[PDB]
Structures are given as structure tokens and as C-alpha cells.
Nucleic acid binder design. Structure first.
Ligand code: ZN
Ligand code: ZN
Ligand code: ZN
Length: 84
DNA sequence: AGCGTGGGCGT
DNA sequence: TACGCCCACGC
């Protein structure tokens, strides 16, 4: 990790410089992606993609056991474990 | 449950 | 750079 955050209060370090460039948005407060629906801003395009599903009700991820649908794969993952 | 949001990293 | 997921933490 040759790339450290130059911010005074922060001690984080990164392997790839591009990851620090993304991280630095936490301190500058830049949120480049906007929701056309509710006008809310987001720091990441991937998080913007999933936020919009809270409006459309789109749920691409169904549980392998019962078939209950989820907007994000991680919610389905958190759910599947309840069948154990 | 509903879902924000950072870290690791692949395309 | 710009984007897209997995994985995880958090409220
Ligand atoms: Zn920092
Ligand atoms: Zn929105
Ligand atoms: Zn299920």
C-alpha cells in the first residue's frame, strides 16, 4: 500500500491509486451521481443503481429455496441463511 | 426488513 | 477514468 490518504485525520492506505481517488470523495463530499426520480445525490454509480430499485420495485435476485425476490444480491444472501 | 455506503478489485 | 459486483458493516 504505497498510496495513503493525505487528509490529516485519516490514516487509511490503498494498493491502487484509483482506490484512493474514490476514497477521497468521503472527505470532499462529492456525490457525482443523481437520482432522476427523487433528485437525491450519491457518491457511487453502483449505489445509485440499487437505490433506484427502491422506486421501481425491481428485484432481480430470487432465493433458491423459497423464491422470495430481492433488489440486491447481498439481501438475498442475508435471506437464504434463514432456511438453515 | 429496507437500504445507505465504503473497501477490494475485475472489465 | 468510469463502471459494476461481491462482500460487509451499520442503522
Ligand atoms: Zn481518508
Ligand atoms: Zn431516488
Ligand atoms: Zn428463501
Amino acid at each position: 500500500r504505497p498510496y495513503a490518504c493525505p487528509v490529516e485525520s485519516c490514516d487509511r492506505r490503498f494498493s491502487r491509486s484509483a482506490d484512493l481517488t474514490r476514497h477521497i470523495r468521503i472527505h470532499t463530499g462529492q456525490k457525482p451521481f443523481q437520482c432522476r426520480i427523487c433528485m437525491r445525490n450519491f457518491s457511487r454509480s453502483d449505489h445509485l443503481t440499487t437505490h433506484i430499485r427502491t422506486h421501481t420495485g425491481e428485484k432481480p435476485f430470487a432465493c433458491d429455496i423459497c423464491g422470495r425476490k430481492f433488489a440486491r444480491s447481498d439481501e438475498r444472501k442475508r435471506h437464504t441463511k434463514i432456511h438453515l
